[PDB]
Amino acid sequence: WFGHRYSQFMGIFEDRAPVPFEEVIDKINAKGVCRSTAKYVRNNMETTAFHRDDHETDMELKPAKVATRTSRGWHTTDLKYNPSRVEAFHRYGTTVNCIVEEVDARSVYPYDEFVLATGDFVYMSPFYGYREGSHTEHTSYAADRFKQVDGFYARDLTTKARATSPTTRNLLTTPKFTVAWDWVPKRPAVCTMT
Amino acid sequence: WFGHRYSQFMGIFEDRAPVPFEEVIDKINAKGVCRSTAKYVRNNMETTAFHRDDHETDMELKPAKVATRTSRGWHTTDLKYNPSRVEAFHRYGTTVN
């Protein structure tokens, strides 16, 4: 709200939107860029947000500010966009910040789910997949929320270097984020004895 | 906000409202139903919300979706109500579950 000689936030709606699979593959992993728009399903509605309420553009992912004992991160925008002043009016401003975070993930027996460093639960087995009978592993999400890419080469966002050895990349779109990790067979990877 | 060829959430206000004692006794425990309206005191104001912005009705409580290692739950609505499209307008929609 733009009053006389002062401005006040009537509201700040903050949301986390998953990056679609095609954007993770074609834009982030291939070119190190994100779309300036966020199009996603929230509250049973398809919603589209435009950064600075402008047309869609490709924006470069840059390293986040260094923090102690913190993993690597990248983002596109560091400033929040607020609407320009118009006196005696309520105005709205949209900020879209594409964020990529390398995180540690932990799973306890029987490994039907795992957690991320952010504290977000993923209700899918870390070993879920399409091969070696891993399709029988637990999943809570719909089939279209999961994707598995064979022969995936990870391109580093900082050094811009393509990975030498391919991996099997699991991608899962939760309602808040998309999580990608390397698929490995369960039996050689975990044990109940140490 | 309903723009042209796109819609965007300007805001999503989320609240949890207590079920009044008489509703717990007479409706939920006696009939397994809930009122479609939430009338409660929030921020020193009596606020009333109507599901889908419609008249008050009695809605059956149905078992929630099964999850592993979770206790029993019941709810009335599984879909969030959003206002119908009207171009170049901000519209509000209420969901009471």
Binding site: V41, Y123 | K65, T70, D78, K80, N82
Partner: peptide
């Protein structure tokens, strides 16, 4: 607590349907 609260939409809502 985090596990049970972050299952809320999977139990009481629908995260896939688009109206």
């Amino acid at each position: 607590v985090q596990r049970r609260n972050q299952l809320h939409d999977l139990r009481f809502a629908d995260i896939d349907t688009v109206i």
